[model samples]
Target: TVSDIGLSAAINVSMAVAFLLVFAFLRLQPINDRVYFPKWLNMRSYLKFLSWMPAALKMPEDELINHAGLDSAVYLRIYLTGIKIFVPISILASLVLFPVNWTNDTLDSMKVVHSKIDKLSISNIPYGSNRFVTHLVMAYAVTFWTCYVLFREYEIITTMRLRFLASEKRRPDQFTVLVRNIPPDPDESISELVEHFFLVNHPDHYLRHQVVYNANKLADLVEKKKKLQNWLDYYQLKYERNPSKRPTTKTGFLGCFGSEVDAIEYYKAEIEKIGKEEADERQKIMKDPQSAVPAAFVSFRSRWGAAVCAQTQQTSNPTVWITEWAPEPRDVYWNNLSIPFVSLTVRRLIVAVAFFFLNFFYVIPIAFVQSLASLEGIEKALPFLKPLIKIDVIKSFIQGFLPGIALKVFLILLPTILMFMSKFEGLISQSSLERRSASKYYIFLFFNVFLGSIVTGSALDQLKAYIHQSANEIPRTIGVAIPMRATFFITYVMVDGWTGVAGEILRLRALIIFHLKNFFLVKTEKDREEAMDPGSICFDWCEPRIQLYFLLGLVYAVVTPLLLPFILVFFGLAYVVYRHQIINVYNQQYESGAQFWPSVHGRIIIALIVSQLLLIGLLSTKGFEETTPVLVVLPVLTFWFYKYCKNRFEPAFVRNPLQEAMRKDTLERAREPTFDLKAYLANAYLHPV
Candidate 1:
């Protein structure tokens, strides 16, 4: 890595400007209007590059909530939260900690190998130096301030969800319980058994139960019918425009093979053929007892019954007759509903062990690849191939970068495997899978990304360090390595965090592949309806990296304050960029009303605990270690604060209180006494396909 501060800044700064300039020009092209503005299909500006920024600010918060959904409003608050924490820490650090470390001469006096920037870090505080006292004060302030902001945000978010839920119109999920793992009886069919069990259990308020059927294959039949209908319309248009002679087709797939025929008539006959298949499949789904899944959507007479049914256990054995409030029909992962309870449990256990070995097994190969791919190794492996490697550009990139690029690609694919693990565990909804996978990703990152970066060399090398290095030695390892690696971390921030933000707006793969597809096959306008941004924010992958940067900012806040500004820059750009995206590009899959807040809060708490302990560890190495114990107190208090927040506010995330449910039902009923609650609720929980 280039350790020179000025040169690195120059490299990164130019990358930022060039990308922005290119993005500006590309965005101005009218052909890209849809790609850039998929949110509208969305905004234009040219001379004033600055104008697009204020739009994030100009758009009112309540309006953003209205347009982009509460989940997004809360998600963007993550950036707001980051900016909030660091803006003050940044000011305090540069003003106080920067000069505090700057005035010291310990690194220079000791002749330690460090960049010019290293002196601007806590590493310069030498043995017997009371300078750590200054860092200690600032850290305590940070912990308190961070805890205060976390608590306040948690309170605000708690109220927001409740208000969002109550003020919104009644949802079917409000009075519905999705029951899975129904213990079977030989005497009765699944539907009758579900109805009979619920009717007897909740005799005062039983309404109805909708049975689940295995219709995965049946949906594909209707989907193909829809696909056929699009071509039928396109062919009709072709025929209408060309009255000189009837347009023609072939009898084989895509009209490309077999004997020719009239296009319109061929498509019409195909539609009829597929329509018959769809009808037959529909009949089969309805009549076949073997197709019934052991699951049901049980609707209740009141919100009270729905809440109690979800919150209370259904049977003495909890595994049988599992119940939870039904997800919005839009959100259900339908295939998982049929998975039996024991199957789901064992799958979960297997996937967990699978992930464990996945991390360890992967690290060995990556370490081996990195170890063997060094310049000397490359030169030693092949003598004649060194001619091309003599070129500076080729040598610099192929020698210095490709191994990291290989590892980067490997890391990118890791989340996909993690997602598969979550899916195989049989989580019952789309958003739950995202949240679960995001958590799994964080643990992987902490072990292999954050913790991996804290030391240099392969995981094997670090593994040796863990074994041979005593407890006191690892903190010393962090203490010494953090300052030296500060430059590389900065370069990483510029590349991944800053340069990549620009690429998001560029929409490289999207623009390239989308145009290539549409250029050859922009066949039907009817299909365009669905193409109008079936956009999902890749939250499981995206959300964890943000937490990764948070861990970096917190871990480095005391060790190196300079890194905070770069992070602050990332926070600033991402804030506006994502706001721009949410307003214009991405669409919500479902409004769980930011159900991800608890996980977000917990991850930040993990970062804070790491930050505190690392700082304590670093300080322990510098001095005789008299009052290092005081620094240990910070993590305990932070832990207690987390427990306190969970007790006070986490309930709002997980449970809808009886009072809230009852009040919502009362007000809803009073407003529309003639409302057909049963009919509406029944229609809502029905399968679309």
Candidate 2:
């Protein structure tokens, strides 16, 4: 019922309000503000009085920029763009398409029909009626508006990124190139070889270099020491409080089982052993040339030199002495940094093929699990349990819940599997790994969740049908059913889009996980702070998921006007919630200078193209043969527009202009002519302890 939907929406809004209140309360505490809003704490004294007032909720614009950085500010713009595109479309759809869809009584003419569901959507319109013309025009309007907003935002973010880079303080990454695939020479060590090569090729600009280390084993030893040290602290505190009683622990993994021993002495002895082992490993890494990988962070005297090295090939061989602008030290994925170029290439190819098979075939397991989860299948497999299953409520619960739960469980595991594949693909940065995994996950969800829902079948069945089905047959297969599934997707929007965004504001998952770790694992202030680093925007997982809503909005703008407001609410609420999070909660892991924006722009273009092709299917079924041809042309133009944008705006993201580099270099030198850049960069790339 509309009233039921309104009530559900009210409840969700109330929950969102409750979350806001909690956020406000937490922000009032000085500890939380320092942890969550450290970027804005400069004016803490001025705003201290407002801690008890609602004005504390407001964040200043200058503080937002100074604290969050330009990349985060630009990321917020993505949500803003969503609201800009959808809000107007929602209003237009409500005024125009809603009337056209609801007044049509085609479904009412049928003997049996879901009046509320069918009549409120395009399904209510009579076949061959010209009412679809209104939808078609509105689709065009929505697409144009989306593209307009995207282009404008792209230009704005690009300018902001460039200006941010120019005006920023000196960063090691600005004057460093990460050189990999160093040619081996038995006579020279990795560090010596890197110094010789860079001096020979770039003596005028080369300042210093740091060789990469294979420190996995050393890292493990250090971690073991920290755990033992923490346990020692726990026992020392116990003994200090009560001198009569002594703490005891077993000499086994995590002290679960083994011979019991005095905990203090046990940890003290273990810590000594690990300290010696760590010292030995550290000595080995420093003295042994074999511990160094065929990679080095080569620093330059100027940003111009670094930019030149990154953009230009270093040698005629092209494969050896591979150079790219070094990511910030903290942004490095050290484990895979040593992967050889040839091996990395092969790994990516293997993962790509694996991802394709997995995306299509992953459904086999989901379907099988869902089948066994069914009441009939359960009864057949376990006849003894059939008696219990015969109860109406139990049957209803099993039938209604079990199959969906199976699918949900698989969905949860899907990202983990994809992440493992991405790791195996030999990506050398956390950001890149996440982006690759997110793209793979999006492809899987688009087919299995989006198209599969419309087909009302398993992903495997729909994939097989897509394979065998003609281009014309493809749209007709799903397009004919798109309208009927509108109601299911409306519920999906409310649950996944609406409530999910609200839940994101609450940070329920992060909050619960933080508390669990604090209770069981955290033993010190550092551990708690590390656990509480609210984390930056997860671009890989989040951006593509938001693209799913864009897909839904573009697909249903005309087919079901009712879905638009839900989407509108999602965009508006998501914008506000994520803005608050970026401002107060998330501490960015590394600044990428809005590098993820181009991929976002590209994906939205893909969504627009997809919506156009699907519209052809829907229009053809509606007897608009001429309109289908026009719709086919829309995707072609959209593809061209994407290519055009790629050429024009994408290079701004990938390559720092030599002019900007020179300008910044001149300013930096004039500002700090005596800055010891070589000294600054010498230890910047050293393996983290």
Candidate 3:
């Protein structure tokens, strides 16, 4: 019913208002300000005050960026990119396309329009009608506008990144190369060998070096000591507050087993014992050759020297004397730092094989679970449940609910497995690992979730059919199913996209976790800090999911105009909420100079190609044989545009330019003529523990 639409809209609007109110209230408290608006930690009071006012409506750009990093600021622009593209397109679509679709009434005349939504969609247009010309024209307009927005954003972000890098303060990674797999030398220690090799190879620019220790055991001991020290602090605070009673603990793991002991005395004794062991281990690491890994952070005299060293091989035996631009000390995934080149290559092959099987076989469980979700399958599988299944309500509940929940559970856990796969592949930094995982997950999502939903049935069966099907037949098959699923997708957009953004604003998961941590773990300011885990934006999950909506919007703009408004609302709400989040919350773990943007841009282009091919197939069904050729050309042009952008902008994100390096070096020389490069870099690369 059209009346049902009003009820649903009213409910959504009410929920949206409630969420915004909660966000507004959460931003006001000083304690929660850290939780919700950590980015504002350094903002000016007057500016923050203005931000507090709803009428002001926006945070200052500098303050927002200062709180969040350039990567976060740039990420926010991704949603705004959607907003800029879709909102205007929605208006244009409403003005031009909606009337064209609705007034056709071909479906209504044939009694084929099942609902009001169908009448408002291209499905209302009769077969062999010329009305699709308007749709085709509008699709081209949408694509052009999207590309224009994307290109301008890319240009602005690139310039902003370059300017930011140029004006930034000097950091250790700028002048450092991480050289791994150094061939072991019998005559000299690891430290001496590293120094001698760098001096011989890069004599004019080599400043200093630090050899990383195989300190896994020492690190464990040090962490144990810290925990004990925290326990001591907790007990001491307790004692100071209550002189009448002595604080006590059990002498076992987590103090839950074994003999009772004085908490203060036990923790003091534990810290002292671990401290002695740590000192001994440190001395062993300093003296023993075997304790040090064959990896060294070799710092150069200037950024130019580091860049040259990083780009050029150190020796003819490339595998042994591997050198690359060192990730920052904080960015280094210490566990992966010791992997030999051969082992890393082998690991990559293994993860690749694992990922292939993981993606392909992922549907088996969902299908098996879904089979049991039905009453007949359930009765067959579990004869004990047959009696209960005879009841109509129970059968209906099982058929309706169980299959979707099973699929949802599997989807939730899929990313975790993919992350493990990425970690196993031996990436040397968190950012790289995440990017790799994100890419892998994107492939999985594209095939399994996006394509799987559109072309329904067993995923395995679908894959087999597509492999056997002709290229021309493949799009036709998918295109036929796409229009039939329009109603299902509209409901999906409401539930997943619309409500998902609303759920993001609520931060229900974060809220629950925070309360749990506060109740169970927090004992002091340090504990509270540790317990309040303000996680970074998960690009691995968020970016891929957002892209799914883009694919939907692009694919449906011509087929279903009603879907565009729902997708537009999603983008608008997401833009505002995510902007607020980046401005007020989410501390970035590491910056990659917005390196993820290329992959993002590439995916959108992929979606564009996919949409065009589907449109070609759809048009062919409608006897627009001549126009299908024109539709095919759209994908070709889109691919070229992607390649052009890849060539122009991707290099900036990958390597530091030699010209930029030399300019910074020249500026630094004039600014501080007597800077102690060697002394400053001497111990910067040592393991933190």
Candidate 4:
């Protein structure tokens, strides 16, 4: 028995290790240029174009090979961490659920003491109650761990969203997006707005744009609290409830921004300073055109144009002089190879590590503790269970199923309660700080009450069941759909396919935002917008992480379906809508060749629905027809997510070094006449002569 258990544990470990390797390899494969793009697609050239990044310091941004997110080194660390946590827990779970001993009934109703230990096994319990309970514990552990891991994957998407937004260059109307007719109140200068925000609100999540956001948010809260108190005192309502309801706020960027429109003021001040600086510099050049003209034109006009015209005085003014003295581009230094591969590797690693530990260690413990006691002690500790087991002691099989998971409801409810309390303010009351603290107290009470009730009543419930029931048809259902079996494979597919692809699209959106923003907002006026395409440094720096945004949306769209059968259709529809919206956004940004427009996106939606139905059919036939197949859904979904993200997040160039772009005499191009009338006039003059 021990050897069999050991062998099974070893096999399980080997399987997990194999799956982990596959996960790591498939994730990192795009980096090595082994990605399996269909030939008809002809994405290779596009992909290779993205792969021509220089050394580790910088990399190409083609989504296929050089797409950044999780780094390889991080992935290895996560895999090892998963191994560390998953292997031991799985072994322990198997030991608890699998049978340790077996025996046969003999000699025509002979008095045989079927040991208590055997009775604890699925083969001995009435209707397989004990076995059912055992598997239930295992399933809970697996679910908890799996959910935890996937949630981390979602985080990758969220993080990337902020990064993309930070690096994005919004259109000139970036401020216009926030403001309308300005404030209606007399007290509202941009500075007042800043001060009010400083007194009242806070950023919920930190973003690169919100450097002074926190300070302003805390101030806003202080102001609100003071106002609320003053109002109460003046009214003399003597209402403790309202007083306790201090206007506390949720923390996040939107929350912080809600309290203050200071970004406008901040940028307004910055723009003023920049304009003044540029004007002063212009005056300096105008004051010294003789020396400045030659130097400025060297960077601006053609080489010969500068040499011939620098000394010729009639045309030199501030415009010509400043133009001539244009600064040397440092694009080579700035756009040097960024860690596309390393970023990709890091993203993968964070997801992997977050998934592994949450699922294996923390979630597993929570699931097991929630289920084990309730199912085993309360349901079958009765005389009826004894008789059912005695009759089929030799033939009894397939037990310990539903009752175990039924016990796990308590575990699920804990998180549910917490979720509700956080969302609904009225239930907790106003002194949210006090209420929040008290809520934890109530949660503790709730658990204790439920547990105490179970302990007090379970013995009686078991006695009642024994008097009424017998082991009727439960012997056949044993050992089916073992929990934690093949769970890792399911997880791999989900993370790599569904969430990752979603993340990629979000990254693209961020890139667009970055370019549009910087084009209008950055202090420089020397045509900085020309470098705002994906090939530039900003997109490479930000998109790798923004890909995570889609991950969050994808997770929300799919999580319900994964957990509940009735919700699967809803999840499919949501995902389809999400994909369509994202692809539409992609089309708006660049021509994704075929315009994978709404029409094509709709087809992909239908295909996904049909595919899901087919999967359900197959699993049903195999008697593994639970909602669990969603576990296997991750890898394919993640792959698609990555593929799409690569499409959008790809860098501007794959082969040409940005330095080439830098070296191309941008200043000279700027000086080229928008219209060429001199040659046309000369030709007319020749005809007249």
**Which candidate ranks first by lDDT, i.e. highest?**
1
Give the runs in model 1 whose Cα sits over 4 Å from its true position: 1-46, 100-110, 113-120, 203-205, 215-285, 364-407, 454-479, 520-524
TM-score of each: 0.82, 0.81, 0.79, 0.21
Give candidate 3 regions above 4 Å deviation.
1-30, 35-57, 108-120, 123-127, 186-189, 215-286, 364-410, 457-479, 509-533, 622-624, 676-679
Ranking by TM-score: 1, 2, 3, 4
Write down the lDDT that model 4 would get: 0.30
- Between prediction 1 and prediction 3, which has the larger TM-score? 1
Arrange candidates by lDDT, descending.
1, 3, 2, 4
| Predicted candidate 3 versus true structure: per-residue lDDT over 125-179, tens digit per residue | 4464666666666767777777877788789878888877787667777777777
Question: What TM-score does model 4 achieve against the real structure?
Answer: 0.21
lDDT of each candidate versus the true structure: 0.65, 0.62, 0.63, 0.30
Instruction: For candidate 4, write residues 1-689 as lDDT tens digits.
Output: 11122233334544454344334333531221121122114654334322312222132222312222211112221222333333443444445423332212211332112122211221222244333344334434433453354345334433443333333221111111111111222432323432343234332221111111111223333444456454443233323223355634322344435543333335345434764565455444433422210110011122222222333333234222111111112111111111122244564466446434432343333334333322332344442344435533422222222223243344434444443433322211122222243334333433332323333333332344443354423432222221111121123223333333334423445445554544343355533333322321122112212222222222222211121221222234223423232222222121111111122223233333333443343224423444454535633564465455445433221111234233333543455645242332222211000
Candidate 2 lDDT, 1-689, residue by residue in tens: 32234335446575655546554555432243336543325464454434433433365555667775545777666676566656667667657754664456445554222223435445543564666566566666666766776787778777767767766777777777777788865755556656766666767566655666664546555565567666666656544544445434333444476554454566566657766876686757666665666777776668777676677776788788777677787887765556667787788787688777765666565456434332322333234344544444542433332343335445665577777777778866676666767877787788877865544343323344322234543343444345544544554555456555555545556666655555543356576355555665567668677878778877776666666656666566567667666766677777755567777677777777777776675556545476775687677777888889988888878787888888877887888868676676777776544
Q: Which stretches of candidate 4 lie over 4 Å from their true place?
A: 1-80, 85-190, 193-399, 405-418, 425-689
Each candidate structure's count of clashing pairs: 2, 0, 1, 81
